[PDB]
Amino acid sequence: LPVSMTKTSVDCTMYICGDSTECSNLLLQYGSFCTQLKRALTGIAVEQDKNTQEVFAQVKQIYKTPPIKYFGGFNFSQILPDPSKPSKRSPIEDLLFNKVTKGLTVLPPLLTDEMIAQYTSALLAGTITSGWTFGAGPALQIPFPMQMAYRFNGIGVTQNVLYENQKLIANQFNSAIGKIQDSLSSTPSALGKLQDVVNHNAQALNTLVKQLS
Amino acid sequence: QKLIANQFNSAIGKIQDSLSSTPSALGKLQDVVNHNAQALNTLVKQLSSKFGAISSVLNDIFSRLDPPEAEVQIDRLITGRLQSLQTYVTQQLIRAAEIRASANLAATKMSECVLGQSKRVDFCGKGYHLMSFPQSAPHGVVFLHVTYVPAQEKNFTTAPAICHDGKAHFPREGVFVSNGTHWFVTQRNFYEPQIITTDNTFVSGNCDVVIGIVNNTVYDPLQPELDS
Amino acid sequence: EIRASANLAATKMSECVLGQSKRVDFCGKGYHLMSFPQSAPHGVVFLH
Amino acid sequence: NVFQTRAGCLIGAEYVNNSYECDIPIGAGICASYQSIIAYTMSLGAENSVAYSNNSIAIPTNFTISVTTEI
Numbered sequence: 001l002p003v004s005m006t007k008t009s010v011d012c013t014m015y016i017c018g019d020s021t022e023c024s025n026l027l028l029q030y031g032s033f034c035t036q037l038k039r040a041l042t043g044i045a046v047e048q049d050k051n052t053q054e055v056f057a058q059v060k061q062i063y064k065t066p067p068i069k070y071f072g073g074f075n076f077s078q079i080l081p082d083p084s085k086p087s088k089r090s091p092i093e094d095l096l097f098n099k100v101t102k103g104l105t106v107l108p109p110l111l112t113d114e115m116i117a118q119y120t121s122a123l124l125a126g127t128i129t130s131g132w133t134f135g136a137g138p139a140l141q142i143p144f145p146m147q148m149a150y151r152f153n154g155i156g157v158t159q160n161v162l163y164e165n166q167k168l169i170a171n172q173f174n175s176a177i178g179k180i181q182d183s184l185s186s187t188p189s190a191l192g193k194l195q196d197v198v199n200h201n202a203q204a205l206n207t208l209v210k211q212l213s
Numbered sequence: 214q215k216l217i218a219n220q221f222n223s224a225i226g227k228i229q230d231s232l233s234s235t236p237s238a239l240g241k242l243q244d245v246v247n248h249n250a251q252a253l254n255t256l257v258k259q260l261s262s263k264f265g266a267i268s269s270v271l272n273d274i275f276s277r278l279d280p281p282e283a284e285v286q287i288d289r290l291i292t293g294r295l296q297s298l299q300t301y302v303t304q305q306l307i308r309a310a311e312i313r314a315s316a317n318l319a320a321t322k323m324s325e326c327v328l329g330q331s332k333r334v335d336f337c338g339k340g341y342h343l344m345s346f347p348q349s350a351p352h353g354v355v356f357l358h359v360t361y362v363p364a365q366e367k368n369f370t371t372a373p374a375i376c377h378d379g380k381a382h383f384p385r386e387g388v389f390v391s392n393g394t395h396w397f398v399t400q401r402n403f404y405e406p407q408i409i410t411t412d413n414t415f416v417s418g419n420c421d422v423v424i425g426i427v428n429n430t431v432y433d434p435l436q437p438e439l440d441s
Numbered sequence: 442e443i444r445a446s447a448n449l450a451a452t453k454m455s456e457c458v459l460g461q462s463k464r465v466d467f468c469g470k471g472y473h474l475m476s477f478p479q480s481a482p483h484g485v486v487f488l489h
Numbered sequence: 490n491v492f493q494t495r496a497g498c499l500i501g502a503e504y505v506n507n508s509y510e511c512d513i514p515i516g517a518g519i520c521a522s523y524q525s526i527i528a529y530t531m532s533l534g535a536e537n538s539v540a541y542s543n544n545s546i547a548i549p550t551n552f553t554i555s556v557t558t559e560i
């Protein structure tokens with residue numbers, strides 16, 4: 001799911017008239033079109049920043065996973081952050097990053113990718129260690145197999161189904177996550193919903209620039 | 214009951230004080246109004262622009278020039294003003310679409326959170342949702358979400374099941390806990406110990422397959438009655 | 442359009458991740474158990 | 490009093506090693522505020538490590554009836 005696009009800003013007089021002073025003198029009496037366009041683009045930029053903040057910053061705590069990463073057979077190494085990498089990112093999100101490629105300026109986002117990765121890591125640690133209680137108040141730690149048993153109780157299956165098939169469920173989950181990793185590494189168009197976003201915005205700018213000719 | 218009532222009264226009092234003492238909390242609605250006013254003002258300013266004509270007043274053009282080129286000047290003025298009006302209408306349409314989306318969201322919230330209880334997380338307030346109240350406001354609606362939040366958590370030792378007489382007893386609705394020596398069962402969101410009996414636990418298989426099972430006795434209410 | 446999509450993504454994060462959703466097909470095909478978020482260039486990827 | 494940021498060059502405010510919440514957004518993780526004008530790296534939130542273990546649970550013992558407003 002896309003969240004925010006590239007924030008762009010325009011210098012109205014510089015784009016319209018360039019370095020001709022008489023052009024600016026003639027321009028100043030067409031009114032406040034430049035002010036309107038600057039206001040609209042600033043509104044879009046702040047809306048993009050608010051969108052990112054709302055979608056990601058949903059927890060007021062930055063939880064940290066315990067050093068001993070054993071969860072009753074479940075393997076979360078594919079989605080947990082990798083300490084060795086300087087970027088502090090899991091293999092899946094690193095694959096995602098590697099899989100996606102005057103008068104007009106591009107403003108950088110307020111939240112860098114590192115802070116977004118930190119929020120995602122906090123959410124993962126919270127939802128792994130403390131179930132779903134951390135989203136409704138304090139964080140309540142709980143063993144992971146018990147959380148999965150609770151989640152089966154959510155869908156109308158008693159816990160004895162889980163507790164007597166824990167190893168099989170763990171193996172199936174690990175195999176499924178490996179298959180997802182390989183599928184992401186194999187299909188190029190799977191990220192199209194994001195890619196076209198860029199492939200839209202950039203080309204739009206190009207067309208605008210072509211209008212100078 | 215009395216404690217919950219007191220907490221609710223204190224909460225609504227704090228809400229009233231917070232709304233009274235914080236002016237920025239009502240920013241959203243305020244913004245709406247400002248935007249509209251701003252737009253109108255900008256439109257008026259467009260009447261003060263020459264748009265490249267010799268003057269920005271139609272009367273001056275008419276009383277100063279003959280029709281043959283006064284019509285050219287008036288053509289320029291009309292096309293400029295028409296472009297400005299087109300821009301204003303387009304901006305109004307976009308803002309109206311945004312307000313339509315917000316109104317649809319508000320209607321969904323009114324239908325679900327009000328007149329009902331929602332299991333959706335954070336859709337009707339932070340924490341477990343209890344109920345809600347609507348209030349009107351200039352060009353908007355304010356929801357008071359009354360919600361339930363746990364506090365004063367306490368550590369306990371847990372086992373997935375209880376092995377007794379070779380049978381594995383699992384909790385029916387709650388969870389097994391241990392205050393250090395004894396084993397009880399209690400519901401998930403509140404602490405209320407109960408004796409592990411055969412009515413709140415159910416038997417499923419033997420105790421050789423589950424991982425982490427502990428040994429304990431399971432009280433039976435029928436045995437004392439059959440003793441007499 | 443992007444803001445509407447971001448609102449949808451925020452709802453998905455609030456429901457599928459921080460809780461269990463009983464809404465059919467909202468958090469993946471089948472009976473939903475849980476989910477994980479991941480970042481991506483100008484977007485978020487949910488593993489249901 | 491010159492600072493180099495990803496967005497650009499900032500003059501008139503002093504960088505502070507301390508971290509707070511964002512007040513005026515500048516960009517690239519930098520936010521400025523007035524307390525003199527100081528620019529800093531915004532703080533995501535208070536870190537809270539939860540003691541997770543495979544045979545321990547935490548059970549609430551009390552509750553609170555909260556009321557929130559949404560406009």
Ligand SMILES: *[C@@H]1O[C@H](CO)[C@@H](O[C@@H]2O[C@H](CO)[C@@H](O)[C@H](O)[C@H]2NC(C)=O)[C@H](O)[C@H]1NC(C)=O
Nearest residue numbers: 069070071073074075076077078091174177178
């Ligand atoms: C969890 O999964 C990871 C990777 O999915 C496992 O790491 C692999 O370990 C084997 C043997 O030690 C190596 O041959 C592979 O190269 C490793 N994979 C990677 C990506 O480095 C790990 O063993 C699994 N189990 C645990 C407990 O972490």
Ligand SMILES: *[C@@H]1O[C@H](CO)[C@@H](O[C@@H]2O[C@H](CO)[C@@H](O)[C@H](O)[C@H]2NC(C)=O)[C@H](O)[C@H]1NC(C)=O
Nearest residue numbers: 365366367368369538539540541545546547548
């Ligand atoms: C349950 O027990 C754990 C550890 O026995 C407690 O975690 C400790 O909390 C204190 C409180 O500040 C910290 O100083 C320690 O560093 C924590 N220990 C670890 C290993 O992280 C936890 O607080 C207990 N639960 C409650 C509700 O008191």
Ligand SMILES: *[C@@H]1O[C@H](CO)[C@@H](O[C@@H]2O[C@H](CO)[C@@H](O)[C@H](O)[C@H]2NC(C)=O)[C@H](O)[C@H]1NC(C)=O
Nearest residue numbers: 369390391392393394395396397398406407408
């Ligand atoms: C765990 O709870 C049990 C049940 O209340 C406690 O056992 C009781 O303790 C009280 C306090 O001394 C005694 O008056 C009762 O006679 C005990 N009942 C039984 C059946 O033993 C137990 O003490 C608690 N654990 C701890 C460490 O205090």
Ligand SMILES: *[C@@H]1O[C@H](CO)[C@@H](O[C@@H]2O[C@H](CO)[C@@H](O)[C@H](O)[C@H]2NC(C)=O)[C@H](O)[C@H]1NC(C)=O
Nearest residue numbers: 375376377378379380420421425426427428429
């Ligand atoms: C729970 O009780 C069972 C039987 O009452 C224990 O199983 C016995 O364990 C001892 C010591 O390992 C063996 O010598 C016996 O042969 C076992 N008997 C049976 C029938 O399995 C079991 O060990 C107890 N649980 C724990 C954690 O000690």
Ligand SMILES: *[C@@H]1O[C@H](CO)[C@@H](O[C@@H]2O[C@H](CO)[C@@H](O)[C@H](O)[C@H]2NC(C)=O)[C@H](O)[C@H]1NC(C)=O
Nearest residue numbers: 215216217218219220223364365550551552553
């Ligand atoms: C649960 O919390 C409530 C309030 O948060 C506690 O009620 C307070 O109790 C103290 C001591 O008895 C009084 O001084 C306060 O006035 C009470 N508050 C209110 C609002 O009446 C209650 O005691 C707590 N429950 C437990 C078991 O500790």
Ligand SMILES: *[C@@H]1O[C@H](CO)[C@@H](O)[C@H](O)[C@H]1NC(C)=O
Nearest residue numbers: 068070071072073542543544
């Ligand atoms: C449970 O946790 C303890 C310490 O946290 C560890 O020593 C033990 O190996 C774990 N048991 C399993 C079955 O993973």
